[model samples]
Target: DFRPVVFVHGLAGSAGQFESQGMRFAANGYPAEYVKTFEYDTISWALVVETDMLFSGLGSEFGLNISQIIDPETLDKILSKSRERLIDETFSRLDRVIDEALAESGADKVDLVGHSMGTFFLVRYVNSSPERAAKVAHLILLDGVWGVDAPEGIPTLAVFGNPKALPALGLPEEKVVYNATNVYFNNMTHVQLCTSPETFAVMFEFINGYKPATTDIVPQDGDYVKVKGKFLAFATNGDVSGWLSIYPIDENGKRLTRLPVKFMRVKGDFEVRLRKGQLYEFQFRKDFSPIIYHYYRAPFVRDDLWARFLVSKPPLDVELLILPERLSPAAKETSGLLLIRYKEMIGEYDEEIGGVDEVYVNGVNVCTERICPIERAVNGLWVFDRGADGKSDLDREVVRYSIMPFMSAADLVVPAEGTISIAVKSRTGGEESFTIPAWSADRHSIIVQFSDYIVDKLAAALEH
Candidate 1:
């Protein structure tokens, strides 16, 4: 049976970084869906939040209150353990994905591929348990250093650009094979080692049955020019993940090739490489189109193929930064301002808008029940209007509308110190709830941003 392939990327990179190998695998004959990529937060502090979420999920999913396992004062110490602890936690999540893959395909095992730091994690993961070793059909490591022995009896292949990192692996010669020179030593940096076509050929030949005659589609000395581009009016940069999905196209609006030409960074000063004589089209993801617009310039000669993407100013519901606000508290019915800010959603299809079609406050339907009044404002300033009875405009039936981005303030009455639940309903009909602790103060003001990502996470948490 053909086992599924799971690709894990190295430090500071997302799954999309392996887009080439993924697409190349599909182009060769493997089911595109069979190739999966696991993504984790690369940001240092982001990992801290992820650790909290992991334990939180474990608590809710498996009924394990991991908080009791350690001292609250020393909770920070959990982060201090070796980087292996981080890998351990990642495997905790990765195992589920692998299980689902195996269950869905009816395959008993899977092939594991890792790049850079990801290779290190793979070693710890497969060796973590005998059960884990039983589930791995093969292992491939790219551009990573390993001193640990290979899982006994598992066939392993290690490809590296650094010769020094290869000698330390204490593995039996029959169980594992290696390549530290030739293609690896060819002129390529760490990033190029993963992105380059030469690397893909070796990877393709190893995983799949055969290799393609050629991996280079673009000519080395051809007159391919450069173009400039940017994303304008996007609600938040978070939507793009600091990456661009570039597709080469013809004038007829048809794809010139397979999955994608490449995934590149959106740095303002970066250039796009494209064939000079060819006309191409670039399209943004559906969610990015609502209020955001894209502007591009014609291909120009820059000694290479490239393009420019220009993005417009801020749009509605684009960015919502959730935080804690300090305000005076009240007696019996504590009144505090809860600020909700959003940026523009390009179209109705934006993920953020799709998930949050209706917003809820304190477990009540603010859209249908009209139980609470919300004030609309932009930036840091509030815009107010009154109805016939002098109630806020949001309270008026005719003026009620889906929440917009930026400032949307709501005043709620709660216990002097307790928890408040904020939830959202998707247009597709699923509802999700989130609970936040109320700070004790004379006046309590809490600011939270319910972005699409957070809402989806909370919804999944509720399910487990």
Candidate 2:
């Protein structure tokens, strides 16, 4: 029998990171019910990308019933007043998570995994009380917040991409050098350390006592997969009291049917089955605005419990560092495209931090040194007209979101009359492409997504 596992995500983070890991666990005989991710509001507006006016020039009054449109001064007080109590409060929340995990599996002890800031809480949970430590069968820390050593008696493992973390803590250069219990690698990014197949192998052995039979998100015969996740407000991290509708889309990424297969007032968790290699358009609607968030996905190849649509409004939720072209209302004649890849980097490649080579939006590669520089570590790119000049100066770097890490934009004024086709080629020559109608970006913003999975080449290329 396998012990239940609880995952905790740290700052500017969400349980979404653990979505694949849960499936990997299930793929390897662990009960799907045994894997749980603890969700909480950890991204502090004042702390992450700390800036004088990172949130300046913003206003969003929509969805006040869900989350207050938090401003800087209000955010300042929110951060300051809770500085002393927040961490412990999060611990209380985690405690409840552990109890739930145990209740579900009928296991006396649970395996606990923490990523980034999540590592801190896991360490604290077991460190604070002997009884709590006793309840934990094993501990795994991913790219920890503050460096930590194995807690007494209980088996513990630390996986590090930031090797400096140990030395900074005045520990051994290879802290885990004592044995296989600790790990140090300077090659991968913080996010990669938690989700990669290689990392999965290490943690699987550390907890399950052996390497997994297969590290691939192995398609389980490529069958239909169920998706479960949250309807949340962006940055603030609260469930929106709202409605969610999932539209079945064609291979070209347009709605296959006028009626949604899944539509309900989902205040919290929602689940549905979607076929592997099929496309979808998830629409999120709240009472607040007519312009709702419509998110597109590459394809559903595996189960995902961390799927989410983070809602943000015109001036308020949009980061101050976002390109003006992205923040401004879409022009009636211009089409806008937002490119996103979760966890994986979307920019010029570097050996240490592997990345996508190019993302072709309308035959123009958007992830170039000019548009998505290496230093930025861009994961989100906006393809739209900059300055409302009715021009597509692709070479010009219109927005460098310095404070906002992993974000970028390209100047491409696609006339909103034809179809918008997009393709991505990863460093390893992995390819995936899709086409969608060029609805007026002003009226309907288009969000295009690609997964970490790489295909040899898309069939659309044969058409050319």
TM-scores vs. true structure, each candidate: 0.40, 0.82
List, residue by residue over 1-464, the lDDT tens digit for candidate 1.
45678887654344434555554554555555677776553322223323354222211211111122234444455456555566577777889889988987788888888766566557667877998888887787766644445567677766655222122233523312333222343223243356445677876666555786655332234576444333322221222324455555443234567875756655433456767655343443333333211111222222221112323222222122211222222322332323222211111223322322455655544443232122221211111121212233444433222233222332334443455555656443345444545433232223332322122455556777
Our model 1 lands, by Cα RMSD against the true structure, at: 21.5
The true-versus-predicted C-alpha distance at residue 74 of model 2, in Å, is 1.9
Off by over 4 Å in 1: 44-88, 162-183, 212-464
Per-residue lDDT of candidate 2, residues 1-464 (tens digit): 99898887754556667777787888888877788887765444223221123222011111221123357575556546454366567667778888888888889999888876566556656887887898899888887643345778888888877442111324534435122277766656556567766788888888888889977666756569878878765545687767878888877667888899888898767888888877788877765665555777666667777776665532236532333554465577777777776544546555665445678878877777766655554556777887767877977776443334346678888777877888887654567787877767555667776765453545326544
Q: Which candidate has the top score in lDDT? A: 2
Best of the candidates, TM-score: 2
User: Could you tally the backbone clashes for each prediction?
Assistant: 45, 0
Model 1 lDDT, residue 60, Cα: 20
Could you report the Cα RMSD, in angstroms, for every candidate shown?
A: 21.5, 6.7
User: Clashes in model 2: which pairs?
Assistant: none
Score candidate 2 by TM-score against the native: 0.82
**Model 1 lDDT, full chain set:** 0.44
